Amino acid sequence: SLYGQQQAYAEPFIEMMDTNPEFRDKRSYMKNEHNLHDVLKKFGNNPILNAIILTRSNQVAMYCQPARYSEKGLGFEVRLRDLDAEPGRKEKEEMKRIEDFIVNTGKDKDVDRDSFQTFCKKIVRDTYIYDQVNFEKVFNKNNKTKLEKFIAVDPSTIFYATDKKGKIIKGGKRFVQVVDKRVVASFTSRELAMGIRNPRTELSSSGYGLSEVEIAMKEFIAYNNTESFNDRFFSHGGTTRGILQIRSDQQQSQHALENFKREWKSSLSGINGSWQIPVVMADDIKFVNMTPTANDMQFEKWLNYLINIISALYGIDPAEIGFPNRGGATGSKGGSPGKKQQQSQNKGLQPLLRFIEDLVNRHIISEYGDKYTFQFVGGDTKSATDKLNILKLETQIFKTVNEAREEQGKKPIEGGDIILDASFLQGTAQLQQDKQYNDGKQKERLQMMMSL
Amino acid sequence: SLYGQQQAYAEPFIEMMDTNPEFRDKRSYMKNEHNLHDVLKKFGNNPILNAIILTRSNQVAMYCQPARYSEKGLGFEVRLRDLDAEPGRKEKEEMKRIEDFIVNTGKDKDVDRDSFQTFCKKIVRDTYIYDQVNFEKVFNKNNKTKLEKFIAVDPSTIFYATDKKGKIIKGGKRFVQVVDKRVVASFTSRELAMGIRNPRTELSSSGYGLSEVEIAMKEFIAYNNTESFNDRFFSHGGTTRGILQIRSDQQQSQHALENFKREWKSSLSGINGSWQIPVVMADDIKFVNMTPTANDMQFEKWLNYLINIISALYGIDPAEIGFPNRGGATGSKLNEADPGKKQQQSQNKGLQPLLRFIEDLVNRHIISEYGDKYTFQFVGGDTKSATDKLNILKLETQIFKTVNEAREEQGKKPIEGGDIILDASFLQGTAQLQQDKQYNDGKQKERLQMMMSL
């Protein structure tokens, strides 16, 4: 079963003729193709797709460091789930250990291992080429319960394992690694993650993702063709401006024509000849124009249209990648945190972050139990000025001088323990007199009782 | 009956020729077609439709996390229905358990199961291709009353079951799953949800939805045709600029012409020849122009028009997805969304229906297992910074709260000299009442002294 025991079928009921009984083929949407990822691999050098992949992975890479050590607060943090909890002495150390483990991508430091930055760049590339991310989790050999490493794996090699009955295996070796159409490794669901951004209920989708390269493939081909078309003017074209027709009773001999070429080049070529005019006395002379006087690129609008579509599918502004955004160029105003940057982050960048977070939470942190959470966190506008303004209000509303000083680690002072509000002091000054009056009243009552 | 016992007929009175007596066919609007979803499946790879599905699903995905654990408050929450109620000790834990269940899409954690994000993405795709969402509810095998999982199911496989009398079944196995025109499963109303965005009273609609792909189908075909037209210039066309006519008393032999081609290419081709001019002494030479000097795409306006219609049907801005809006960009217009003029309206139009629909399904089908006291809602963020909370309390402490009540609500110890409102007039009042007491005390003591004297 794909997910679990269910009475609705979630896979093709009749076993389709997969090339191998042991794994599910990555069939194209129309089933016209069974080796889709080897098709997509040919586009991994596409300049537009790589410009997108690089801009996204560069943006993501800024978040890879822990926020804990980043004084601006920008980065990631490992946190307790409940916002209301205060972490225990051991919990704070466990959270710091998990952060360090993530940074190092493993228990020990090892310069030969990918950093978390390299891991994130890898899986971003994999999402945007294949829409499939895989990383293996390696447990300690002596203690299978202890996680030691996680390493990203080539998604083109990972396939769903299938039972002899053509059903996808659950509980067993759910995944296999296939190289040269033989199984070179196998994995449980515990040992290998799979992440997909564009899921489908479609039975024949067989649980695989859906690459934007597949959807946009016609556009990419059209792009390639128009680029080659515009380039071939130089590479293969005739740039010849025109034909100089000279005509007389009979054509000149080849010798005559070649020494006419010598007179020409010796009199008119380069800078040296540049402003001289030939005199020629042929019976008639004509020049036939074969090209436009001013050549430029063609199909610019077509290109813009294509790239606008591809950008809309990927969720990126064409102007982010050096194209006009058709229609979108008008307006795009905003306010507030940068007017446009904030929404251009919303478009795409936030989903990718939350996808990475989801993968990490499901696969890694779950080894440590549900009390913790991994989240990326942006900065805050909480400078010393802002914190002092906030506390300047809290000290009217809540905080005595000594509570504030204690929060700074500064010794409480005699004459603290007071709210900085004149009404509070007028109250205490009233109550003091009230106390001294009641003391007098009660003492005089007692003295009267003793007199009687 | 479709809904229930009623004296008005809600279905075609004469049984229409369904392919199978056992289930109602998904007839096309005009009944020109009986396998409509197999038609629509061919459009599921359309780039425009996929751009819409991906943008909407990505927007929805951000709400999938619980608000409880999300410090910006953005996500979903499970809540009591009444705003006036205060949750009991057990209710808070039950709500947290239900939230966790939703996140996990089931009782236990299982990496093999869809997350809520994947579920929402799936059902969004299903709504916009088919206008039909289905997910099965799986109960515990030992206790049929205990829900364990809910899983999204391929809507193209789900059909209404029909009695032998052609009536839609109610109370029994209302639904069947059909694969290869054989029944592979059956379901009660209890076990499978159906949600539809575009209902119709039309008797022959038989309770099925209405896909925008059906309505827009002509536009999608026109789009495909114009795209193929523009592409075929390279793929299949003659790009030939023109014909060089050279003319003399008789045509050259083929050998002569091929060594003329050799003189030409050896003298004029590529960068090497790029600025040389041939001299030719034919009797006459002419060049016939067969194409425009400057080619570009055609029917761009037609494309914009088509996509404008499709966008208007789906409820999305053309300019969200890289097309001109033929409603002028300044005509589209203290806040109601995330910042930015473009996004606020398309946010309203797309998300608020879609979100409220997803909520509707969750509430009717899942939460109803726990009874009506709870409600599921998506929630946006809030403008409740420390500054705003301090401003609010700075007013509440003038209007309501003594220092000690405020501090206690923070869990901070009450202070001697609290229990007072922070207003000078309040203290002047209490100082008055104090003097009043001291006066009445004096009066009463002097009354007592006179009475004892008297």
From TrEMBL, chain A:
Domain of life, source organism: Viruses
Binding site for Zn(2+): 263
Coiled-coil spans in chain: none
Shown part of the complete sequence: 49 to 506 of 563
Keywords: Metal-binding, Viral capsid assembly, Viral genome ejection through host cell envelope, Viral genome packaging, Viral penetration into host cytoplasm, Viral release from host cell, Virus entry into host cell, Zinc
Protein name: Portal protein
Organism from which the protein derives: Staphylococcus phage 812
Region ranges (Disordered): 327-347
Signal sequence annotation: none
